Each structure stands twice: as structure tokens, then as C-alpha cells.
Amino acid sequence: YFQGVEYGFWLPIFGGWLRNVNDESMPPTFEYAKQTAQAAEQLGFSTTLIAELNLNDIKGVSAPSLEAWTTAAALAAVTDRLEIMTAVRPGFHNPAVTAKMAANIDQLSNGRFTLNVVSAWWEEEAKQYGGVFTAHDERYDRTEEFVTILKGLWKEEEFSYKGNFYELHHTHLSPKPVQKQGIKLYAGGESKRGKEVIVNHADAYVMHGGTVEEVSVKIEDMKNRRKKVTEEPLQSFGLAAYVICRHTEEEALEEWRRITDVKFVSKSQLEQQVKLNDYSVSNRGLRPNLIGTPEQIAERILAFEKVGVTLLLLQFSPQLEEMKRFSEKVMPLVEAKRKEL
Amino acid sequence: FQGVEYGFWLPIFGGWLRNVNDESMPPTFEYAKQTAQAAEQLGFSTTLIAELNLNDIKGVSAPSLEAWTTAAALAAVTDRLEIMTAVRPGFHNPAVTAKMAANIDQLSNGRFTLNVVSAWWEEEAKQYGGVFTAHDERYDRTEEFVTILKGLWKEEEFSYKGNFYELHHTHLSPKPVQKQGIKLYAGGESKRGKEVIVNHADAYVMHGGTVEEVSVKIEDMKNRRKKVTEEPLQSFGLAAYVICRHTEEEALEEWRRITDVKALGYAGYQDFVSKSQLEQQVKLNDYSVSNRGLRPNLIGTPEQIAERILAFEKVGVTLLLLQFSPQLEEMKRFSEKVMPLVEAKRKEL
């Protein structure tokens, strides 16, 4: 078939992606986000993920950062085909207001609004922004309720709910989303409890960076669990990755050295410096190893596609320029290699 | 990878110069292929293949390559070059064209684009069965033409009834590689032309102009487009012919050579032609190279050419569509000498 991996990108909302570099020529403005998003649509990217944080965890708590939900709404209004996946943390949100905001954006975008339900917690951010803390055990319980409420409000003419964290009586919501089965819910999480929520309540699974072998195991495990459960198959498997594409491997590696200088180490040492890689680039972006020539990156993308990855959630820096490079040099090679016999 | 993309016209007419005869540019697929394969190693990202059934540079009986078969052949032997191919609605069946286009995009792995051309050469139409349309309804035909293309690339089953074409429950498979379809560039200066571009095309291309003319043309097009949609035009393309030389004087001398229209007992008078005079010989410039190539004035040293490109980039040009002669060798010079200066001058500015 003509039906392979989708290319998604993280919407640049923090003024850059790199903890170790100061200026990446990525202004933290809506204009830059919009420009990047409108170009991505021309270049073959199908989806953007908009992270939700009240504080800039790449450049520092006092560094400027765009707000997720209002950025999503504004971006929906100025795009026409991009899927706009927006992160939501239950502890910073009221589920009934959120279900309404969500339907509204889905309506004004004609069906392009989706959610990434995040149950991670940054304590410092919670204390600054009035997050409701839940004990680590009970955190995924809250997510469960929150998500049950969203789905109910999107489906039912009248919805009531009684649980441990929320209570609603005869709530009406109109209009409903454009998406006929509710707004698509992506979700991630590594814990046993976290994975139960994905399995039982999410429409799709997203993960942070891993090797092709690690990702294969997680996708296969997850597919198996999901068969033992009364929902339809998971609709996507998303992998976070940071891409360094250069004409030669050696130039790629020199960029890798640059972005991991804390603000000549060899290939093998770069590949083994896990702690520093993780610090230097969020979501374990470097671990998928999309670092090299277009040829190498294309082969590697294809290996991820074979073990079940259906969507890449890519970061680049400087973002707009590096996305253009990726569309021109990597994408045609992925197509060609998939058609090879 | 930021600011201006470098494109080039695929050499399909045996040269670019109407006043000069041997440019060392054979009118063959082999030389076109050789140019495109080298371009891909020299920092060029796009080629534009003109569509004409007759050679409007070297004469109607001089050899010229046909656009669509050349595009398909070139796609098969390149890897990264965007292959922008011109298409005149009056010479084409929109449904068959949508199908050809999808087929080239698939075998190119997503690199095929179109330049929708609504200009019309009457002698060519008569010689080649091109369907005449009234000056006013020429762009009506184009509008219907592109609506059918985009419809067939997007929908499982597409129907259309209009003034020029009618289709019933049309299927087309496979679709283009990317879901958005196939990028449509378009040119045109008339009010009616501009409306069609802004309402139905994805990008705008222009014949040569001064920085000031191009700045006005672009700003106007941005305004027209904004009134109709939030999605901007994806590129602003500008044709230019490049004469890069180590000294300005040598560049001026090549400019003189290629616009010199004189052996019928005619030397001329006031024979020494100045820089000022070369700049102002609009009609002779327009005849000597196509698409007003000389009017952007990319003529001089590597430094002068780089500053002028930056000036074009500042008023919104995103893509240059370059001609040179002899093309292969001059592209190599442009890549070695101009491109780095453009990179350096941007960064410090």
C-alpha cells in the first residue's frame, strides 16, 4: 500500500528545544509557531503536538513560553489541514470546561483537534500554578475519571457522573465535536498503572524516544494487552524523536557534540552518554538515533515503521529550516526505500 | 536552508539567448540530465521545465524537448530536485493531466510540482491544436482546470460540470504521494489572473523585475490573498538571468555581447555602450533573454550579485528561477562564488 508513517512535529513554543544552547533563531512567539505550522502543512507534515506547561522547562522558568490551549485555538483558525494535538493535564483543568473548549476548537477547525492526555507532574510547576496534587498511586485514577467525563460529554445529550474526584449532574454540552466518536485521545506513560489507562481509555499511544528494539517490545506488549480489552485497536503509535540530518555523518556527529556541550568525543561515546543526551534534549529525543545522513535517517525511520510506529513526533533546531531540509532530503528517500524490493 | 531557494530552468531549447547561436548547450535530454544531476550536488533545489511545443529561443524549427515526457524521465534519474513542470490548460485534458501528474509524483517520490501557465502563443495554438479562449475567459478555463486537478487528487470519486469540462464520478488511483496534493505555482499580471491565483493556486511566480517592482507585486499579492484566506502563498518565484564574473567590467561586456543585435553593414554609432545605457535598454533586454531575465540585474561580480539577491529576499522573494549560459559551467560558478557570499552576508545582517 501507499500507507506509511505520518510526520508530526512539536510546535515550537519555548524559544528553542535545546537546554545547552542560548539562541536557536526560534523566537518564542506565536508568529514563529504559525509560520512553522503553515510551512509544515506545505512540506508534508500531517500533525503538530503542542506541549502544555505554564513554565518554560527548556530555557528556564522566567523564559517566555506560549500557552497551549489558546495557542491551539489561534493556530486552528489560521491553518486548514494540520492536525492539532494539544496536551492536557487533568490536575490543571476542569474536565467539563475542557470538554467544551475542546468541542469548540474541533468545530472551528472542522475536525482537526486532538488531545494528548498527560499524567506526569512537575511539582514546582504545580506549586506556582495551583495544580491539584494527587498521590502518585491515585494520579492515574484522576486521569481515568477526567477522560471518562470528556468522552461522556462529547457523546451524550445529558451526562451525569459520580466518582472520587469529580461529580456532575445532567450536564449538557452543545455543539459536540466534529469527530463522530469523540475527540481522538493520545496518551503516554511508562508505569503499569499508566499503561492500563492507555489500554483501557486512550485511542492512541505515544512514547518518548527509544531504540528500535525497545520500541518494538513496547508496541507488541501494548497491542497484546489491547486485544484483551473491549475497545478497537489503538489508532496510532507515536514516537518522539530529535533529528540531526547533515550531508555527512561526521557533520551530524559534530552537531550532536555541540548540543550536548553543557552551557572530540566519539560516535560510540555519543551513543552511550545517556544521561547527558536525556538532559540535552527533552523526551529522550536523541535515543532513536535519527542522527546522520538522509540515507541513514531514512533507513532508520523505516525500521521504526516496521516494528509498528505510525507517527513520528519530531523536533529540530532551528526548527523551520531543519523541517524544510527533512522534507526535501529525507522524505523522498523514505518513500523510495519503502518501495524497494 | 533559510531564505532564498535556488531554482534553475531546465535547458530544453539548446540555449537561452536569441541573439547568439552556439552556447555549448545541446538541445538533448542527455545535457538536461547532466545539468540536473550536477545541480543536485551544487545547492539547487528546484528545476522548472517550460512547456512549449515550439522553440521560442532558437526558432520554430530548432530542436526542443517536450515538457511532460522530459519531466517523467528526469524524475526517474534524480533523487532530491523538485521538478516543477509547466502546464497550459488549453493544450491538456485535466483528468488525464491529473493522472500523469500523480504518476510522476509517485515515481519521483513526492517531488513533482506544476506551474500553471495561462499565457498563450497564437501561432503555437494554431500549429498544435491548442483550444482558443477569449482573453477574458482564459482564466475561467484555468480555474476550472485546477479545480478538477485538486478534486481528482483529493476525492475517491469526483464529479464536475462547468463551462469548459464535465466529468462524472471520476476515479483516480493512486493519489499523489502527500495528502495535500501537488503544489500549484501560477503566474499572471491581469486583475482576473491574480484572482485565480489567489483563490485556486498555492504559489506565485513572476517574470523579471527591479527590486521595487517585485516589492510592489509581492505586497499586493499578499494583500489580495489575505482577504480570501489565512493560508499564505507558499512561494514567490522570480525569473532572472545571471552574469557573474570576476570584475564588473567583464560582466558588462557579456551583457553587451548578448544584447548586441547586429553583419549587414551595420556597426552602429556611439558604439561604446555604457552601464547606464545597458540598464535602460528595456526592449532589447526583453528580446535578448526570456522572462525579462536581465531586468533583475543579477549582473556583475559575485559580491554585487549576492547583495542584490539579499535585496530581493528582503522584499519577499523565496525562490529564484535562474538561467545561465553555458548553463552547466555557470551553475558551478554560481554555486562556488555567489551562494557562500549570500550565506555570509545574511548571517552578519
Within 8 A by CB and 6+ apart from B260, the residues are B19
Chain B residue with Cα closest to A326: B1
Look-up: residue for cell 518513500? A335
- Name residue B273's beta-bridge partners: none
Record the cell numbers describing residue B264, joined without a space. Answer: 549587414
- Smallest CA-to-CA distance from A151 within A110, A118, A115 is with A115
- CB-based contact B183 A325, cutoff 8 Å: no
Query: What's the residue count for chain B?
Result: 349
Which technique?
A: X-ray
- CB-based contact B1 A324, cutoff 8 Å: yes
- CB-based contact A332 B202, cutoff 8 Å: no
Q: Sign of torsion, CA B102 B222 A320 A89?
A: negative
Which candidate in A2, A46, A297, A319 is best for mutational testing of the B interface (most B CBs within 10 A)?
A: A2
**Cα(B235)–Cα(A37) distance, integer angstroms:** 15
Record the cell numbers describing residue B305, joined without a space. Answer: 550579485
* H-state helical runs in B58-188: 67-76, 94-107, 122-128, 138-154
Instruction: Point out the residue among A41, A77, A339 whose CB comes nearest to the CB of B180.
Output: A41
Query: What's the residue count for chain A?
Result: 341
Which candidate in A335, A337, A340 is best for mutational testing of the B interface (most B CBs within 10 A)?
A: A335
Is the separation of the CB atoms in A46 and A8 below 8 Å? Answer: yes
Q: How many Cβ atoms are within 10 Å of B131's Cβ, its own excluded?
A: 12
Q: How far is CA B248 from CA B257, B293, B299, in A?
A: 14, 18, 8
Look-up: residue for cell 493512486? B174
Report the Cα–Cα distance between both ends of chain A, in Å, rounded.
14
Task: Tell me which DSSP letter residue A18 carries.
Answer: B
Within 8 A by CB and 6+ apart from B331, the residues are B8, B35, B38, B39, B42, B44, B322, B324
- Name residue B206's beta-bridge partners: B238
Within 8 A by CB and 6+ apart from B223, the residues are none
**Cα(A133)–Cα(A316) distance, integer angstroms:** 33
User: What burial class does residue B205 get, using C-beta atoms within 10 Å of its C-beta: 0-12 exposed, 13-18 middle, 19+ buried?
Assistant: buried
**Cα(A58)–Cα(A14) distance, integer angstroms:** 7
Q: How many Cβ atoms are within 10 Å of B287's Cβ, its own excluded?
A: 13
Q: How far is CA A188 from CA A119, A133, B131, in A?
A: 8, 19, 58
CA distance B245 to chain A (A): 29
> Containing H/E element for B275?
helix B275-280
Please spell the DSSP secondary structure of B172-198, one letter per residue: --S--SSTT---EEE---SHHHHHHHH
Q: How far is CA A321 from CA A24, A177, A326, in A?
A: 11, 34, 9
**Cα(B116)–Cα(B112) distance, integer angstroms:** 13
Q: How many Cβ atoms are within 10 Å of A40's Cβ, its own excluded?
A: 25
Look-up: residue for cell 497550459? B88
Backbone angles phi, psi at A47, to 5 degrees: -145, 140
**Cα(B205)–Cα(B114) distance, integer angstroms:** 11
CA distance A234 to chain B (A): 22
Which residues on chain A are in Cβ contact (under 8 Å) with B175? 2
Which residue type, as a one-letter code, is found at position B70?
T
- Reported as half-sphere exposure (CB side, CA atoms, 13 A), residue B266 has a value of 5
**Cα(B144)–Cα(A217) distance, integer angstroms:** 51
CA distance B157 to chain A (A): 18
Record the cell numbers describing residue B347, joined without a space. Answer: 548571517
**Cα(A239)–Cα(A241) distance, integer angstroms:** 6
Q: How far is CA A297 from CA A11, A244, A248, A264, in A?
A: 21, 9, 12, 23
Q: Which CATH number do you get for residue A143?
A: 3.20.20.30
Please spell the DSSP secondary structure of B80-92, one letter per residue: S-EEEEEE-GGGS
Q: Which residues of A touch B (CB under 8 A)?
A: 2, 38-39, 41-42, 44, 46, 77-81, 318, 320-322, 324-325, 328-329, 331-333, 335-336, 339
**Cα(B337)–Cα(B252) distance, integer angstroms:** 18
Chain A residue with Cα closest to B106: A335
Chain A residue with Cα closest to B1: A321
Within 8 A by CB and 6+ apart from B113, the residues are B82, B83, B84, B85, B182, B183, B184, B185
CA distance A166 to chain B (A): 40
Cβ-based contacts under 8 A for chains A and B: 55
Chain A residue with Cα closest to B175: A2
* H-state helical runs in chain A: 30-42, 68-78, 95-108, 123-129, 136-155, 192-201, 212-227, 249-259, 267-272, 274-280, 294-306, 319-325, 331-339
Q: Sign of torsion, CA B176 B178 B179 B181?
A: negative
Which residues on chain B are in Cβ contact (under 8 Å) with A41? 180, 231
Backbone angles phi, psi at B28, to 5 degrees: -130, 155
Please spell the DSSP secondary structure of A272-316, one letter per residue: H-HHHHHHHBGGGTTTT--EE-HHHHHHHHHHHHHTT--EEEEE-
- Smallest CA-to-CA distance from B258 within B62, B50, B25, B21 is with B21
Is the separation of the CB atoms in A183 and A177 below 8 Å? Answer: yes
Report the Cα–Cα distance between both ends of chain B, in Å, rounded.
16
Record the cell numbers describing residue B306, joined without a space. Answer: 549576492
| Burial call A68-87: b when 16+ CB within 10 Å, e when fewer | bbebbbbbbeebeebbbbbb
Is the separation of the CB atoms in B130 and B93 below 8 Å? Answer: no
**Cα(A304)–Cα(A61) distance, integer angstroms:** 35
Is the separation of the CB atoms in B199 and B192 below 8 Å? Answer: no
- Name residue B83's beta-bridge partners: B47, B112
Which residues on chain A are in Cβ contact (under 8 Å) with B179? 44, 46, 81
Helix (H, G, I), strand (E, B) or coil at B25: coil
- Name residue A76's beta-bridge partners: none
Q: Sign of torsion, CA B160 B163 B165 B166?
A: positive
Q: How far is CA B16 from CA A210, B12, B287, B288, B292, in A?
A: 53, 9, 11, 9, 12
Is the separation of the CB atoms in A49 and A10 below 8 Å? Answer: yes
Q: How many Cβ atoms are within 10 Å of B330's Cβ, its own excluded?
A: 18
What torsion do the CA atoms of A300, A304, A307, A310 make, to the nearest 10 degrees?
Answer: -150
**Cα(A113)–Cα(A338) distance, integer angstroms:** 30
> Containing H/E element for A49?
strand A47-50
CA distance A84 to chain B (A): 16
Record the cell numbers describing residue A124, joined without a space. Answer: 514546582
Maximum separation of any 2 CA atoms in chain B, in Å:
68
Resolution (A): 2.3
- Smallest CA-to-CA distance from B239 within B190, B290, B193, B301 is with B290
- CB-based contact B230 A44, cutoff 8 Å: no
Look-up: residue for cell 507585486? B217
Tally of structural domains, chain B: 1
Is the separation of the CB atoms in B97 and B75 below 8 Å? Answer: no
- CB-based contact A2 B110, cutoff 8 Å: no
- CB-based contact A81 B179, cutoff 8 Å: yes
Chain B residue with Cα closest to A246: B1
Which residues on chain A are in Cβ contact (under 8 Å) with B232? 38
Question: At how many degrees (to 10) do helices A331-339 and A294-306 cross?
Answer: 60
> Containing H/E element for A113?
strand A113-117
Range of the domain at B312: 1-349
Is the separation of the CB atoms in B323 and B240 below 8 Å? Answer: yes
- Reported as half-sphere exposure (CB side, CA atoms, 13 A), residue B251 has a value of 22
Is the separation of the CB atoms in A13 and A54 below 8 Å? Answer: no
Which residue type, as a one-letter code, is found at position B33?
K
Chain B residue with Cα closest to A247: B41
